Amino acid sequence: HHWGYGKHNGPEHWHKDFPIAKGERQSPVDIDTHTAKYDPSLKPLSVSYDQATSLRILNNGHAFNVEFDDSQDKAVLKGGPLDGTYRLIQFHFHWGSLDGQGSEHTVDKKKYAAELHLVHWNTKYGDVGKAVQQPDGLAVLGIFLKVGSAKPGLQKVVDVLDSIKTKGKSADFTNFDPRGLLPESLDYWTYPGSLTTPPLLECVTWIVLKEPISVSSEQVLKFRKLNFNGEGEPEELMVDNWRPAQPLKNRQIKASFK
Ligand SMILES: [Hg+2]
Ligand SMILES: [Zn+2]
Structure with missing residues (x-):
């Protein structure tokens, strides 16, 4: 039936409905810091x-998305390995049932507690739907989360999760500043890849930040209280919504720092 992260419809089953799963530029991948070229x-x-x-903020089953107004060049990403302007459309996280897992990308095989994805689309294509159909349609900024001290800027997100507990629920979420989720350094690794959830389109230029941000145990705990199911259906905690590392194949990870 519908894809998910469970035993019977998890990542290992996705290829049956989405052949691209066994593709040439699939994500996430493991970043080998000694093989990445500066x-x-x-x-x-x-x-x-x-x-x-x-x-708005919504629980779409799979994860929760904070959506942005992308009708104009309000929030954009440029520079780095990118050509042109990319508008921020949404951000979501991937997390685990335990602090030792949750991230999608791994650094030297190390898994972090969670991973934040800020999704942007290339303005040259007019809309996100067209953008996903292109090799350079999307640019996703990945930020690792480790458990330690609380991240003040993440609390507004944490406090509203109660109202979007189940699949399909949404809540107005205005005036949230995404700058509060950035680490202080912008050093990164970059490689060509894909979306990590179906349709798994190979249209992404990945930009993974080297420096993780810290979140408290209590903050990550609230992520774990969300549900994959909809209201009235039996409860399945939304945890471990991450896809494991895929083979790098014919790709090279470049680093912006030495
Ligand atoms: Hg594409
Ligand atoms: Zn993601």
């Missing part, structure tokens, strides 16, 4: 989120 020609990332307009 590329001196990579420009600094340019993150312009000062005019960001969040609109």
Whole structure:
């Protein structure tokens, strides 16, 4: 039936409905810091989120998305390995049932507690639907979360999770500033890949930040109280909504730092 993260419809089953799963540029991957090549020609990332307009937060089964108004160049990503402007459309997380797992990408096989994905689409294509059909349609900024001290800027997200506990629930979520979720350094690794959930389209330029952000045990705990199921259906905690590392194949991970 519908894909998920359970025993019978998890990541290992996705290929049956989405053949691209066994594709050539699938994500996530393991970042081997000793094999990633420092590329001196990579420009600094340019993150312009000062005019960001969040609109809503919703539980879509699978995860929770904070959506932004992408009708204009309000919140954009440029620079780095990117050509052109990419507008922020939404951000979501992937997390585990325990602090030792949850991230999708791994660094030298190390898994983090969770991973934040800020999804942007190339403005050249007019809309996200067209953008997904292109090799350079999307740019996703990945940030690792480790358990330690609380991240103040993440609390507004944490406090609203109660109202979107089950699949299909949404809540107005205005005036949230995404700049509060950024680490202080913007050093990164980049490689060409895909969406990590079906349809698993190979249209993503991945930008994974080296420096993780810290969140408290209590903050991550609230993520774990969400449900994959809808209201009235039997309860299945939304945990371990991450896809394991895929083979790198013919790809090279470049690093912006030496
Ligand atoms: Hg594509
Ligand atoms: Zn994601």
